Amino acid sequence: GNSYTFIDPTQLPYNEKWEFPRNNLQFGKTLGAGAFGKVVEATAFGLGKEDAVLKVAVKMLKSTAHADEKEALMSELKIMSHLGQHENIVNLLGACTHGGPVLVITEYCCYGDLLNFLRRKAEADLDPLELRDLLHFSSQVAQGMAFLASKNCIHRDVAARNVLLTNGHVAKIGDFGLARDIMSNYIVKGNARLPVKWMAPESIFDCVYTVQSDVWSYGILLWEIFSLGLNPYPGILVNSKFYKLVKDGYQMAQPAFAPKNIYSIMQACWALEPTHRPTFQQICSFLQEQ
């Protein structure tokens, strides 16, 4: 057939350069968990050219996991290994694929997730975040998305809860559990629990994902950032009523700390036609100037 084809990174064998011995690894406390597995804190000894002793985060499935889920963690590993590094992504540091279950090792971000961070500040002030800081988080997530978009990697789980804050409070997009690689649609296979309040209409109603779907999600995140971590569509349950509102063009109101320019960016991300939404690169231009 045609001698030229795009290379599907999920089809590539595991790259052995990421391999790290599990006995150079010491597990600590659980950072987050589910039914799929967990992410734990660990100390890595002699990892890469980094600090000889290095605090890292490690993802693993619970021993209960079936063939389905083990394969989904390898796909995740494979996607993350082809991306290359960026300053605003929770980068992959290595893996453990021999001598035991699959472990995926990534940068440890000491201040945890953005959502909880924003909520602690909101609770502390009731008992100090500035607009500049909120803009910086927004701009940094945008930069990471633009990098992902430029790899044809659609994240599919853009939310304050999946943005993490590392040294200097630098924002990084984490959790690639639903990340997928395209090229030009991605169609939803089905029945995975999904983050409905962060999903673009075409993803809900047509099971279709493009990079412009992530832009919708990013707009929701902007709403989360500038409201200091309110749940989206506050007080409105996911049901028939919600889907109607979304399809008929309902949008959340301007949050307390969002300047008009940022709300306008939000609203443009919430265009029903995905191609009428701005690109992540354009969004980087907007926030670099604000």
Give the binding-site size for ligand BDY (rule: CB under 6 A): 17
The CA-to-CA distance between both ends of the chain, in Å, stands at 50
34 labelled ligand-binding: yes
List binders of ligand BDY among 206-245 (CB under 6 A): none
The 3-state DSSP class for residue 121 equals: helix
The 3-state DSSP class for residue 85 equals: coil
Q: Is 157 a catalytic residue?
A: yes
Instruction: Please work out, in degrees rounded to the nearest 5, the angle formed at the alpha carbon of residue 180 by the alpha carbons of 178 and 186.
Output: 110
Q: Is 39 in the site for ligand BDY (CB under 6 A)?
A: yes
Q: Going residue by residue from 97 to 136, which x/- string records binding to ligand BDY, judged by CB under 6 A?
A: ---------xxxx-xxx-----------------------
Residue among 47, 52, 61 nearest 101 (CA): 61
Looking only at Cα atoms, what is the longest distance across the chain? 68
Instruction: Choose between 232 and 259: whose C-beta lies nearer to ligand BDY.
Output: 232
C-beta of 264: minimal distance to ligand BDY in Å? 29
List binders of ligand BDY among 50-79 (CB under 6 A): 57
Spot the catalytic one: 157, 175, 181, 214. Answer: 157
CA dist 258 and 268 (Å) reads 14
Two tokens, residue 212: 């412009």
56 labelled ligand-binding: no
Instruction: Choose between 70 and 169: whose C-beta lies nearer to ligand BDY.
Output: 169
Instruction: Choose between 161 and 180: whose C-beta lies nearer to ligand BDY.
Output: 161
**Are 147 and 203 in contact, with CB atoms under 8 Å apart?**
no
Residue among 175, 178, 188 nearest 156 (CA): 178
Residues designated catalytic:
157
Residues engaged in binding ligand BDY (CB under 6 A): 31-32, 39, 57, 90, 106-109, 111-113, 161-162, 164, 174-175
Which residues sit in the known binding site? 31-39, 59
Q: What residues are designated binding site for ATP?
A: 31-39, 59
